[PDB]
């Protein structure tokens, strides 16, 4: 898509966006995932959905993404704590990070 | 990271958002929520799902950031009432107010 002229023009921005703004935010976005990840992984009561360091990143992704759930009845010890790192967390980047990313990309 | 050069302009960016956008639209935005959440909490008969004060605002908060769910059978005497605070509240956060938050923050 180089060849036409309405084209070369939407397949150089995929570039210029992901060199310069996607992998930006990634590298911030990946340092709260961790820190949330093992947050959230360390004070769950073994035997439920928050199970280990390779399962709560795929749930906190899916709720950055919006899909999911974020339901109270948790295995803690602590679910006031559980519902407050996960509510700060929704706050941190579904609504401050990505649309400031947004703002950047625009 | 306010080392290097392509990322202290991206460090500073979370303080200018945090200290001026995003604590403004909450101050505004928790009066939207108390008042719906209690005019939704009042309504309920008593035995389901919006219990008391401090389950609807959590219903209220997913529903904001776009999960739950937002079935009409509900345990109240007007369920027509009910749907439309719903509606009216949906209306009033997921589009006019974050939407604007949004822009204010591009």
Tied chains: 1, 2.
Excluded: W
Aim: with cysteine; charged share 10%; aromatic share 14%.
């Amino acid at each position: 898509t180089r060849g036409f002229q309405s084209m070369g023009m939407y397949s150089v921005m995929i570039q210029k966006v992901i060199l310069h703004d996607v992998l930006k935010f990634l590298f911030v976005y990946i340092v709260f995932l961790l820190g949330f990840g093992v947050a959230l992984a360390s004070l769950i009561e073994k035997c439920s959905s928050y199970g280990s360091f390779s399962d709560a990143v795929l749930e906190l992704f899916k709720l950055t993404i919006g899909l999911g759930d974020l339901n109270i009845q948790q295995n803690s010890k602590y679910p006031i704590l559980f519902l407050f790192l996960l509510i700060t967390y929704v706050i941190l980047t579904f609504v401050l990070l990505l649309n400031m990313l947004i703002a950047l990309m625009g």
